[PDB]
Each structure stands twice: as structure tokens, then as C-alpha cells.
Amino acid sequence: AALKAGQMQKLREAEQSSKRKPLILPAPQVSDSELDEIVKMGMIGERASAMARESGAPIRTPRAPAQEDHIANEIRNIKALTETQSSLLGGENAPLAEGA
Amino acid sequence: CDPRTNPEFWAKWEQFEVQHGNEDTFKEMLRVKRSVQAKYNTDVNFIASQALARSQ
Amino acid sequence: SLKRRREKLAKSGEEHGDVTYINEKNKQFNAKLARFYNKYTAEIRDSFERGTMV
Amino acid sequence: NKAPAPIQISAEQLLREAVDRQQRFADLEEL
């Protein structure tokens, strides 16, 4: 079992070394330029404090709005466009609650 | 990362999601977790996980 | 040369894992297929192991 | 008995079972 597991694990490692896929990161909202003026303001403030002496904590992911629930919007769109019966019979068009 | 060999990694992601996130991202995390369990639901990974479990 | 012939006959007669063949020529052909094609069929082999996914 | 069997057959098990189910010359004249 040990020797088959060693050959096994070398084969699986060759697999995984091929099987890796890259990482796509989101663009950072605070880029290097605004890092530069925020560190400039920070050093200005602490040097003002230095010359004076010489002389929301967490972040939460915002919820997507309920009217942007594209799935539920599409079930009600599908029901309004599919189970509707013939247009020669008149009748009321069900509301396409589309939103955005 | 396979869940039955990285419990501390999955706990760390749970901590990150309860400190920064909502229940939609939490159910996305659990959907991803059980999808990774399905992916690693093989005989080879079973051998490795059982060996690690009875070696620990 | 005869000794290597005996040794390779013995190691080919050993069987590790699943029988995928029905005779010895089939066993040799399946081993040759594994030597050539396994670098292309790993995802399909994983699917046949676990039972699902592409 | 219709309770599910503890051991479920597989194609490789079938193949393994199919595999499983698969002079002194005395004279110059005989030579």
C-alpha cells in the first residue's frame, strides 16, 4: 500500500501541477495614487503632531437589492411571458417586473 | 483545498465570512464547500484522507 | 537477456488494481494505452471514479 | 429479499471474473 501510494501520489501531483488554474483578482478600489496622497496626509498629520509635541471599525459586504435578484425576476418574467394564453382572447398582460 | 484535510482553512474562511459578509455570501461559501467535497469524493482522496485521519 | 525476460514476465503478471482487460494481449495493449493517453484523459478518469462532472 | 445488497457489482469485477473463467524422442525416426 505504501509503495502504490507513493507512485499514486506522484501521479496525482503531476495531475495537480497541471490542474491548477490562475487567480483573477478584482481591481482594488484604493489604487497606488490614492495610497500616495493618503500616506502624504498621514505623514503630514503625524509631523504636525510631532512639531506640536516638540514645540466603522469592521467592514461588511453590502447585500444585493432584492429587486436585483435576477433569478426571481426571471421566474416571474417567465411566468408572465409563458403561461399567458392567446392574445385574441384579450385579457390582461401580467406585469413584467423587470427593474434593473 | 479539500475540506476533510483542511478544516482550519475552512474555519478561517467561515471566520472571514462572519466578520465580513452576509447570508448570501455564506450560502455561496457552503455551496462551494460541498462542490469541493463532490470534486474530492474519489477513492484516491479517500485513501489520503483516511491515512491522515488515522495518522492524526 | 533471458533473465530480464523472466523478470518482466513476472512483473507484467502482477496486477495492481482493476482488471480492465480480458487476456494478456489486451492487458499489454491497455498498459500501452495508459502510457500514451493518460495525460489527456485525467478529467474523464476522475469522472468515472467519482461518478459525475465533466 | 429486496433490501439493498452490501456489495454492489461493478464492470471491473465482471471483467476480473471473465479473466478468471478464461517430447521424449526414442529414435532417429521419431526425431
Binding site: 500500500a1 502504490k4 501510494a5 | 479517500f46 485513501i47 483516511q50 488515522r54 495518522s55 | - | 457489482i9 469485477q13
Partner: peptide, 29 residues
Amino acid sequence: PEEEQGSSRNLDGRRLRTVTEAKALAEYL
């Protein structure tokens, strides 16, 4: 009998030879 039917499956879709080899690798570790 399990050794005879090592390529067959459990109820959770796992080969009996893989159960046996996992136990053996556990003992080896």
C-alpha cells in the same frame, strides 16, 4: 470474499479494495 470482490462497490460508491488499502495505509502510517 471481500478480497475476491475487491473491485465491487459499497453502498456509498466506494471500492472494497480502496477501503482495504485505506485501512492498510492507516496502519502503515
